[PDB]
Design a protein around this ligand. Structure first.
Ligand SMILES: CCCCCCCCCCCCCCCCCC(=O)OC[C@H](COP(=O)([O-])OCC(O)COP(=O)([O-])OC[C@@H](COC(=O)CCCCCCCCCCCCCCCCC)OC(=O)CCCCCCCCCCCCCCCCC)OC(=O)CCCCCCCCCCCCCCCCC
Ligand SMILES: CCCCCCCCCCCCCCCCCC(=O)OC[C@H](COP(=O)([O-])OCC(O)COP(=O)([O-])OC[C@@H](COC(=O)CCCCCCCCCCCCCCCCC)OC(=O)CCCCCCCCCCCCCCCCC)OC(=O)CCCCCCCCCCCCCCCCC
Ligand SMILES: CCCCCCCCCCCCCCCCCC(=O)OC[C@H](COP(=O)([O-])OCC[N+](C)(C)C)OC(=O)CCCCCCCCCCCCCCCCC
Ligand SMILES: CCCCCCCCCCCCCCCCCC(=O)OC[C@H](COP(=O)(O)OCCN)OC(=O)CCCCCCCCCCCCCCCCC
Ligand SMILES: CCCCCCCCCCCCCCCCCC(=O)OC[C@H](COP(=O)(O)OCCN)OC(=O)CCCCCCCCCCCCCCCCC
Ligand SMILES: CCCCCCCCCCCCCCCCCC(=O)OC[C@H](COP(=O)(O)OCCN)OC(=O)CCCCCCCCCCCCCCCCC
Ligand code: HEM
Lengths: 440, 56, 51, 418, 47, 98, 55
């Protein structure tokens, strides 16, 4: 194959639906292991200030027992077959999945339906998980990146439910009752909002029969989603006891289904990423990475394209000592401007190659493919094939990158989060002025 | 809106912002001097040389 | 020069040509305005009345 | 998707290729060149060598390698264990020739320029400090230092005193003595076998021999304790178990999954872990416990790793060790061993799902054994393991001399003798 | 490479604390540690 | 003969009267700075003392005795290969930049 | 790479005096009269020099 025949030879995601509206999607291989999961259109952005944290609490109680499998029994079953049960929650999505052997798919599927359908939500377990969730909140406080991105979401989407954190404030953790959680599950764990994905040695017809045997009870065939205003704003938490400062800056980027995402991702690949444990250092094609390695300006920087249904965070996060924040801002915004006005074809080619490599390398293993299927059916209503992603990347050039980075970056108000010894984090007006060029 | 159109067409780029400022400075000098002069010669009507020169 | 030339630098030239010509028009208009150069100003309709 | 093609050349080099027709290709050169081949005079040489890819080679400058691998979106990674070094290039299947020329320049024609080498000593400190931000890195380093006298006693990281002193001559001598053909295996996922043969022909003709014959690892049975006050205490207590690829090694794998070898369920309770249940019977403080298995070509380490509160360290360790002794006393059901076998087999099959995992398995197999065996044979070897083999292994651990490494506030941590 | 890495590497930065048994679960080591470096990737260690 | 002219010019240039080699007299731009930074330490120290002695000599408006003058056939172009490699790297970066 | 505003020896002085100078956030209109004084000085030099062209 020539990577054009290899893309054309990738197995096809097969999608069906139950009468209740539960979608069933699978990518089959010849591997002897599979990943099967449920992805739900439920998150913190669906929570208000009183219920905020309920979804994380329900994820916490997910494996602690159902009416059929009390307490540890479920875990025992999973552990007794060599399978791995995992879960996660975001501001928009929730997922419960099993990594099992291909011959364990029936039981795995059964284990999932029970988990999403019949969680006990027992009050004793609710108190134990209350204690656990409080300790995990204090554990999350120690992670400067998690805090700085929660801050970025809180100031960018202030007044909206997208500013909410996934876990909610600790006061809600202490106040959430069983009635709160049962209401959350009854309003958000619905078949039309769920996707049963499976990647690996899984036949779609057999998975569909399993879903019709285990999920057909679910809601047949309503509060959901209001848009979230973006705000140019800054939140600076100064703690000079912290050794390194974290700075996250983002403009309003596109939502999930916007084609602008493909050129913008290309542009982010042009800026790239860095940390001080890199081989390439000063020789890196990314200008910011080479300046950061030559001057030791930062410990790391990453570009990001966070997407929600209708908006997102397009920007960069960097970590540096107190005396270099300013420099890190100057060279980062400059790169943004250099892309808006003078993108240049060869680095667009490099960024396109980086994006194709990221997309292909990410989908390695049954679990990434299962997540791709579930999250893709939630965000696009479809699994976009890699051949299509390649078609969209192939139609990117320096004119396209210049135009889209102009549309999203140039002369736009960013949202800014600073955490730590951030006295040298530039004043908001100085950053905002760094978002345009007078020469241009 | 009108100001959205003005920003999108004339203000977003600094070169075009500056060109708008230059053309506006030219036309503003003309119109502002014309108006201020008319005001001054109305306040002082008949008193100035221009008003009375045509007799000499 | 040798360190210059090449496709990337010609592409940068093409990219910045609109901005350069726009600043050229800015300097042109500003110079016409500051020195009241009638050689051009006599053709601008309303400004024509100033002479 | 074709079948794995495995051949061994007259120079002793192994080449194995599987063309899966995946859009990306991954090429790994696996070498018997871990830190177990260092001696007391060149400690840290192989750590700097791990950091030394992307330096100038005879066929490409440092700038050329960095820029030309990033141009195609490619990846160049070096992963070391105590016994092996794997150099992997991963990119799209249309750009594999460029990456393979880069990889072959990196491994077969390194220049180790004195100024580039002296400008790389700082990443020894950076790299080791980043690794030592995990409390287990230094505990495992100390466990190997205290379990062995010479060879596996060597750290994967450079000694602090050796930083800024690893010379280019040490790197050149190291490559000249360990990067030889009969110590190398080129394994390509997503490539054709004749392509890998042509690649292995254009280079990789250093000596076609066995290089420097490293020493046999000598069991020490010592104890290293690192008081550093950390809120938690990390303790590792092991005995010598068996070398990789044997019936005893498989019994030790089954015993690791009987005792408990990591969590299956997120935020669970580790219900099927007998060690975890033994510790949670009496220890009501936050803790973790697992069985630890470290198999190597000429030896192995089997034991217990515990993380606990400083105050409850002794109770956790005694609880875990006594559970192991109870298994050594013949208390082990058939259902628990069936469950352990299921865990082990599922974990093995899940490890090779990714291209990285499958490549690593094929590379280590080609180095250690010089032959590839399909997962079905691996699984039936797991099946063959009997109950008495597990009971044994546990007996051998209990009756075996112990090496221990702990870190944290150790005022309540026991010694190997108490 | 093209992908950023599950974890970027700040030296001289406290990483994360573990306060619960649920978080502590999985942090015990079971296999020998490997060390990985990369041209354009965060360095990793595994146990 | 080209070498007659070359040895004549080497005598007439007169940095050999100060004990200097040709590479000691090179104007130090950025390429030459990196080339000097890449020298082995013994050659660097020889260069430093030679140059310090020549500065000390010109401070007195003096030259060395003719026996101590650098002979034309014994001038070591010690800095030439490092400079050529530095310049090759710069040229490669520029070729990439186009 | 550098920001010439911070690295250039003249622009470094200018930058530290009037651009990146840390100033109290609450100084009132009464703190304006420094900049007025220096402006008055310049005006006096400007008009006086033009007076000195004829005086
Ligand atoms: C013509 C319009 C201006 C123009 O084209 O400026 C281009 C250029 C700035 O272009 P840019 O791309 O917006 O700047 C980004 C840089 O990375 C610069 O990034 P930075 O972070 O170093 O600086 C951002 C900001 C920093 O702010 C300043 O430099 C402060 C400006 C003066 C403030 C008052 C000081 C006290 C009096 O820069 C500026 O404000 C513009 C440059 C300085 C202009 C100074 C004018 C002073 C008039 C009195 O400035 C110059 O080339 C200066 C010389 C030309 C001026 C006109 C002749
Ligand atoms: C209503 C009653 C009559 C007008 C106010 C009378 C009075 O004594 O107001 C004091 C009162 C200030 O009391 P303060 O806040 O203790 O004084 C702070 C400083 O004045 C500094 O305050 P600032 O920096 O906001 O600027 C205010 C300052 C501004 O002063 C200047 O700009 C310089 C004036 C001298 C040249 O002028 C004054 O405070 C005094 C009046 C100046 C002439 C009008 O003036 C105002 O509230 C601001 C002016 C309001 C004018 C209407
Ligand atoms: C005696 C001494 C004291 C005298 C009085 C002092 C007070 C009055 C003078 C100063 C008034 C305030 C400054 C007004 C100008 C200003 O802020 O400009 C900022 C502005 C920036 O303002 P900005 O940041 O709001 O907007 C720029 C950003 N974009 C482009 C996205 C909108 O400077 C510029 O724009 C510079 C470029 C344009 C300059 C003008 C070009 C045309 C000039 C005429 C033709 C040529 C001659
Ligand atoms: C009187 C001159 C103008 C003073 C008031 C405006 C000012 O202080 O700055 C205006 C202009 C914009 O500067 P700034 O917002 O810093 O953006 C630079 C690019 N990032 O900054 C300038 O320096 C404009 C220079 C115009 C000539
Ligand atoms: C220093 C800048 C040049 C100053 C020259 C003297 C100023 C001057 O003459 O300004 C007025 C003049 C008006 O235009 P004028 O020369 O009368 O030509 C009209 C022909 N129909 O305007 C000019 O001549 C402006 C010419 C600008 C300089 C050339 C570009
Ligand atoms: C009182 C005020 C004194 C003047 C301010 C002195 C400091 C700012 C002037 C220099 C400047 O703005 O340089 C910026 C830029 C150079 O390139 P750039 O990558 O944009 O910035 C790197 C260095 N700042 O400059 C340019 O690119 C200039 C572009 C041509 C001019 C329009
Ligand atoms: C410190 C700044 C200055 C101050 C405070 C100042 C003050 C004065 C004053 C009060 C007068 C008398 C004005 C009047 O006629 O009523 C004057 C006159 C004059 N000054 Fe200055 N001056 C200053 C700077 C300068 C400079 C720098 C020059 C020359 C370059 C200058 C040239 C003159 C001239 C020529 C006159 C006489 C013309 C006249 O009377 O208007 N001045 N100055």
């Amino acid at each position: 194959a020539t990577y054009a025949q290899a893309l054309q030879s990738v197995p096809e995601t097969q999608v069906s639906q139950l009468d209740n509206g539960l979608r069933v999607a699978s990518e089959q291989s010849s591997q002897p292991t599979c990943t099967v999961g449920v992805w739900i259109d439920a998150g913190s952005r669906y929570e208000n200030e009183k219920n905020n944290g309920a979804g994380y609490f329900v994820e916490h109680l997910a494996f602690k027992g159902t009416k059929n499998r009390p307490g540890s029994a479920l875990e025992k079953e999973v552990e007794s077959m060599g399978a791995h049960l995992n879960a996660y929650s975001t501001r928009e999505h929730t997922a419960y999945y099993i990594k099992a052997l291909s011959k364990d798919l029936p039981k795995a599927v059964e284990l999932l339906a029970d988990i999403v359908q019949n969680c006990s939500l027992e009050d004793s377990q609710i108190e134990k998980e209350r204690d656990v969730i409080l300790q995990e909140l204090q554990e999350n406080d120690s992670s400067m990146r998690d805090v700085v991105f929660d801050y970025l979401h809180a100031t960018a989407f202030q007044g909206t439910p997208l500013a909410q954190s996934v876990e909610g404030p600790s006061e809600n953790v202490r106040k959430l009752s069983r009635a709160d959680l049962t209401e959350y599950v009854s309003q958000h764990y619905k078949a039309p909002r769920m996707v049963l994905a499976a990647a690996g040695g899984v036949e779609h017809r057999q998975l569909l029969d399993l879903a019709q045997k285990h999920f057909s009870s679910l809601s047949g065939t309503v509060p959901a989603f209001t848009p979230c205003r973006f705000t140019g704003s800054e939140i600076r938490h100064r703690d000079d006891a912290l050794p390194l400062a974290h700075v996250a800056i983002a403009v309003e980027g596109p939502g999930w289904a916007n084609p602008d995402n493909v050129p913008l991702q290309v542009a982010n690949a042009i800026i790239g990423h860095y940390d001080s444990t890199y081989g390439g250092g000063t020789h890196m094609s990314s200008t910011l990475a080479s300046v950061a390695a030559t001057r030791k300006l930062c410990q790391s920087f990453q570009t990001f394209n966070i997407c929600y249904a209708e908006t997102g965070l397009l920007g960069a996060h960097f970590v540096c000592d107190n005396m270099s924040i300013d420099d890190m801002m100057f060279f980062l915004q400059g790169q943004w401007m250099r892309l808006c006005t003078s993108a240049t074809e060869s680095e667009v080619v490099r960024g396109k190659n980086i994006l194709r490599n990221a997309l292909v390398s990410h989908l390695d293993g049954t679990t990434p493919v299962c997540e791709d299927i579930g999250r893709s059916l939630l965000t696009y209503g479809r699994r976009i094939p890699l051949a299509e992603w390649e078609s969209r990347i192939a139609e990117v050039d320096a004119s396209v990158v210049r135009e889209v980075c102009s549309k999203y970056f140039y002369d736009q108000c960013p949202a800014v989060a600073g955490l730590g010894p951030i006295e040298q984090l530039p004043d908001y007006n100085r950053i905002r002025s760094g978002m345009f060029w007078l020469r241009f | 809106t009108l100001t959205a159109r003005l920003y999108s067409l004339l203000f977003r780029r600094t070169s075009t912002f500056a060109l708008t400022i230059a053309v506006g400075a030219l036309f503003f000098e003309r119109a502002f001097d014309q108006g201020a002069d008319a005001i001054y010669e109305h306040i002082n009507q008949g008193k100035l040389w221009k008003h009375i020169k045509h007799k000499y | 020069l040798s360190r210059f030339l090449g496709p990337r630098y010609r592409e940068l030239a093409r990219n910045w040509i609109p901005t350069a010509s726009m600043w050229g028009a800015v300097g042109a208009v500003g110079l016409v305005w500051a020195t009241d150069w009638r050689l051009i100003l006599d053709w601008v309709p309303y400004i024509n009345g100033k002479f | 998707p074709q079948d794995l093609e495995f051949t061994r050349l007259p120079n002793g080099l192994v080449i194995a290729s599987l063309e899966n027709y995946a859009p990306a290709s991954r090429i790994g050169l696996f070498i018997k060149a871990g830190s177990r081949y260092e001696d007391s005079n060149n400690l840290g040489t192989s750590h700097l060598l791990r950091l030394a890819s992307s330096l100038t080679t005879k066929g490409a400058s440092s700038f050329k390698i960095t820029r030309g691998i990033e141009a195609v979106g490619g990846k160049l990674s070096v992963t070391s264990t105590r016994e092996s070094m794997a150099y992997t290039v991963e990119c799209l299947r249309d750009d594999i020739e460029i990456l393979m020329e880069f990889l072959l320049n990196v491994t077969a024609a390194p220049e180790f320029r004195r100024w580039e080498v002296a400008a790389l000593q700082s990443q020894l400190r950076i790299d080791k400090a980043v690794a030592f931000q995990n409390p287990q890195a230094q505990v495992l380093e100390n466990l190997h230092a205290a379990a062995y006298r010479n060879a596996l006693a060597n750290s994967l990281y450079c000694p602090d005193y050796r930083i800024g002193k690893v010379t280019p001559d040490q790197l050149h001598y190291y490559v000249q003595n360990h990067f030889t053909s009969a110590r190398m295996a080129l394994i390509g996922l997503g490539v054709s076998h004749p392509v890998l043969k042509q690649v292995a022909e254009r280079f990789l003709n250093m000596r076609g021999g066995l290089g420097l014959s490293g020493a046999k690892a000598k069991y020490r049975g010592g104890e290293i304790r690192d008081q550093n006050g950390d809120s938690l205490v990390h303790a590792a207590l092991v005995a010598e178990s068996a070398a990789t690829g044997s019936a005893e090694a498989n019994a030790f794998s089954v015993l690791q999954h009987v005792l408990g070898a990591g969590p299956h369920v997120k935020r669970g309770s580790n219900a099927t872990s007998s060690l975890y249940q033994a510790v949670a019977k009496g220890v009501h403080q936050p803790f973790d416990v697992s069985a630890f298995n470290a198999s190597y070509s000429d030896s192995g380490l089997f034991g217990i790793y515990t993380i606990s509160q400083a105050a409850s360290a002794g109770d956790v360790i005694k609880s875990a060790y006594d559970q192991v002794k109870t298994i050594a006393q013949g208390n082990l059901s058939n259902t628990d061993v069936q469950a352990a076998k299921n865990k082990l087999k599922a974990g093995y099959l899940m490890s090779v799902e990714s291209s990285e995992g499958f490549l690593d398995e094929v590379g280590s197999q080609a180095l250690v054994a010089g032959s590839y065996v399909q997962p079905s044979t691996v699984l039936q070897q797991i099946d063959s393991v009997a109950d008495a083999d597990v009971i044994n292994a546990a007996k051998k651990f209990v009756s075996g001399r112990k090496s221990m490494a702990a870190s944290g506030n150790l005022g309540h941590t026991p010694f190997v003798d108490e | 490479a093209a992908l950023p890495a599950t974890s970027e590497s700040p030296v001289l930065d406290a990483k994360r604390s573990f306060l619960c048994r649920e978080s502590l679960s999985g942090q015990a080591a079971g296999r020998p540690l490997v060390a990985s470096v990369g041209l354009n990737v965060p360095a990793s260690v595994r146990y | 003969w080209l070498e007659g002219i070359r040895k004549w010019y080497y005598n007439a240039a007169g940095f050999n009267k100060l004990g200097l080699m040709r590479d000691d007299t090179i104007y130090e731009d950025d390429d030459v700075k990196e080339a000097i930074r890449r020298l082995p330490e013994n050659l660097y120290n020889d260069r430093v003392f030679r140059i310090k002695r020549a500065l000390d000599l010109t401070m007195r408006q003096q030259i060395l005795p003719k026996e101590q003058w650098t002979k034309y056939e014994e001038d070591k172009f010690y800095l030439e290969p490092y400079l050529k490699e530095v310049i090759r790297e710069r040229k490669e970066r520029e070729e990439w930049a186009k | 790479m550098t920001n010439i505003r911070k690295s250039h020896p003249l622009m470094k002085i200018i930058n530290n005096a009037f651009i990146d100078l840390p100033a109290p956030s609450n100084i009132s209109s009464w703190w304006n009269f420094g900049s007025l004084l220096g402006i008055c000085l310049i005006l006096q030099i400007l008009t006086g020099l033009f007076l000195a062209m004829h005086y």
